[PDB]
């Protein structure tokens, strides 16, 4: 409900992604969060993208 | 600091012999002086508050805390958390230097001054008073004032009664009736 | 305007009573708030379910200055 | 909230958490003039070892009883006393004081001397 | 005419009316009118009876009403199917159990209160009896 689904993508080469939502209006910039990439088995920066 | 001494060097003595207290720790003490400016209309002009704080800042000598509305209430059309005033709590050296500047060179610059009330005590020894014009303080540069503005003073005390509370202030020859 | 609605019963309540012997993990109470609080060898989950952290016998007690209800598990 | 009742309130949570864990706690108490330490058993009602600046054996060697240097001596003492009684692993109960002045000097000293926490 | 000024809920389950009365002594006046049957007093009944006892004494002395109709009663009208929702509140009753002191009175002679309580008694749907204040 106005809250859009986005995917956070692994900054390593893997194509691993977490999925979440965003109020794309009030918080229009790209969400960037450290999370665990299970393919390299290490925590890596993840950066917002479209779904 | 001079007036802290007059408290120690001179006031205690006066009060002990006045009320015949058994322990010197019963003698009323000035605990703190809290300055407040009820702004009320920054809700319309966000900038009216900034100039009030800086008025207090030069008056008190420390950065004021700006007080938010504890509670939204539509009577004054204010939403909770709206900045609606600013305050300063003075203690120690700074409180005493203010206490002096107040009597020695502000109250005299009140327009047609004739003395302060002696009945503005809250009933448990604390005295509160208003000023209409912050221009009585010489830290205020009459040319720069954006606007004349007033001010709450409360002297919180450790007297249990007003009779005791008044003697403490009286003992500084605090101007009354 | 108009009534006629309700929701499913959540089948809450005490699941093992005083004395019942349980293996660790067994839910002892389903509750909304903490009517019973977790005591020794008892865990509290996010919906305030109290569960066993050890094999033993269920023990209800009342403890403390607020007279709160506590569940613990005694080894048997 | 009145200094004392406020500190105790600040302390209650960590102690219940500690009770649940069954830790033997190294409990510190601070006062402007003195500092005190008790190693207390998990039941909460029997003290296994103790040291403080209130015992003459300790204060004799101290400039002023209420400062950081003295607290460091108390820390060193409980640690030693506890190890002679076979005690090694404990948990620290700062008891509502900040972990910081004197209190932090005392812990460091118990740690300097082999007490495990 | 008595009625709750406001209530938490509009309507109330029918419920039942077993039990003995509470508030069984003349606790305000000198004399009382006491319930012997179980049942319902309507707000209008309390009134028909209140007027009469007050007529009867020529508005002398003092009167207390110990009951209050806080129970909403509904009814379904003519030409209505069962169901389709609970009836509408039409009137209010107080539930009466044997022993309830209904009215008290004082400031008048024993003889006159009895006449007055007798006159009201004719307005009520439950048997009553005449009582007096008692030490202990």
């Amino acid at each position: 409900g106005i809250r859009e689904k986005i995917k956070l993508v692994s900054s390593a080469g893997t194509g691993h992604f977490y999925t979440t939502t965003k109020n794309k209006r009030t918080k229009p910039e790209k969400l960037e969060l450290k999370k665990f990439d299970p393919v390299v088995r290490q925590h890596v920066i993840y950066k917002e993208a479209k779904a | 600091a001079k007036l802290h001494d007059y408290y120690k060097d001179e006031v205690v003595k006066k009060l002990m012999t006045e009320f015949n207290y058994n322990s010197v720790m019963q003698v009323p003490r000035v605990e703190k002086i809290t300055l407040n400016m009820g702004v009320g209309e920054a809700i319309a002009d966000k900038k009216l508050l900034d100039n009030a704080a800086a008025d207090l800042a030069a008056i008190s000598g420390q950065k004021p805390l700006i007080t938010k509305a504890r509670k939204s209430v539509a009577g004054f059309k204010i939403r909770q958390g709206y900045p609606i005033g600013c305050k300063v709590t003075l203690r120690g050296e700074r409180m005493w230097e203010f206490f002096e500047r107040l009597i020695t060179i502000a109250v005299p610059r009140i327009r047609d001054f004739r003395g302060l009330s002696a009945k503005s005590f809250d009933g448990r020894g604390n005295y509160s008073m208003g000023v209409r014009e912050q221009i009585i303080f010489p830290e205020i540069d009459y040319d720069k004032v954006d606007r004349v503005r007033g001010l709450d003073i409360t002297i919180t005390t450790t007297a249990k009664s007003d009779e005791e509370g008044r003697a403490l202030l009286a003992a500084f020859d605090f101007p009354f009736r | 305007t108009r009534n006629g609605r309700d929701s499913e019963a959540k089948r809450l309540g005490v699941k093992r009573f005083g004395g019942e012997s349980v293996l660790a993990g067994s839910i002892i109470v389903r509750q909304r708030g903490t009517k019973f609080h977790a005591g020794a060898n008892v865990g509290c989950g996010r919906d305030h379910t109290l569960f066993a952290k050890a094999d033993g016998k269920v023990k209800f007690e009342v403890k403390g200055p607020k007279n709160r209800k506590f569940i613990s598990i005694e080894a048997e | 909230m009145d200094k004392k009742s406020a500190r105790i309130r600040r302390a209650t949570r960590a102690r219940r958490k500690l009770q649940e864990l069954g830790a033997t706690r190294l409990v510190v108490h601070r006062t402007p003039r003195h500092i005190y330490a008790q190693v207390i058993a998990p039941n909460g009602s029997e003290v296994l070892v103790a040291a403080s600046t209130v015992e003459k054996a300790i204060a004799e060697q101290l400039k002023y009883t209420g400062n950081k240097d003295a607290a460091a001596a108390v820390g060193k003492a409980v640690a030693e006393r506890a190890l002679e009684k076979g005690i090694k692993d404990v948990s620290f109960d700062r008891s509502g004081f900040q972990y910081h002045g004197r209190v932090q000097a005392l812990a460091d000293a118990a740690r300097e001397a082999g007490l495990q926490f | 005419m008595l009625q709750p000024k406001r209530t938490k809920f509009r309507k109330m389950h029918k419920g039942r009316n077993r039990g003995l009365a509470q508030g069984t002594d003349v606790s305000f006046g000198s004399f009382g009118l006491k319930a012997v049957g179980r049942g319902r007093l309507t707000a209008r009944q309390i009134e028909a009876a209140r007027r009469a006892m007050t007529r009867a004494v020529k508005r002398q002395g003092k009167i207390w009403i110990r009951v209050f109709p806080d129970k909403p009663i509904t009814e379904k009208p003519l030409a209505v199917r069962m169901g389709k929702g609970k009836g509408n509140v039409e009137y209010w009753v107080a539930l009466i159990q044997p022993g309830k002191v209904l009215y008290e009175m004082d400031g008048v002679p024993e003889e006159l209160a009895r006449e007055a309580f007798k006159l009201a008694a004719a307005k009520l749907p439950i048997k009553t009896t005449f009582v007096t204040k008692t030490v202990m």
Binding site: - | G61, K63, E93, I110, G115 | - | - | -
Partner: protein
């Protein structure tokens, strides 16, 4: 008292008028110095309004009548 956010605060000296009892005080005001290295500023102080200064008024405040 919190580093790096307050208003200077010096020990200023205050000069009065037809009376030679300056005072020195905290205050934040700005002026220009002298004796042992302070401030200055000529007002009309406590020992001046005629309910502090008790009587003697005259001065350059105001009057109450002339003659008679």
């Amino acid at each position: 008292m919190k580093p790096n956010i307050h208003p200077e605060y010096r020990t200023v000296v205050f000069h009065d008028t037809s009376v030679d009892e300056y005072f020195k005080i905290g205050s934040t005001i700005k002026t220009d110095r002298e004796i042992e290295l302070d401030g200055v500023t000529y007002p009309y102080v406590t020992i001046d309004v005629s309910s502090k200064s008790h009587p003697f008024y005259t001065g350059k405040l105001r009057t109450v009548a002339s003659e008679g």
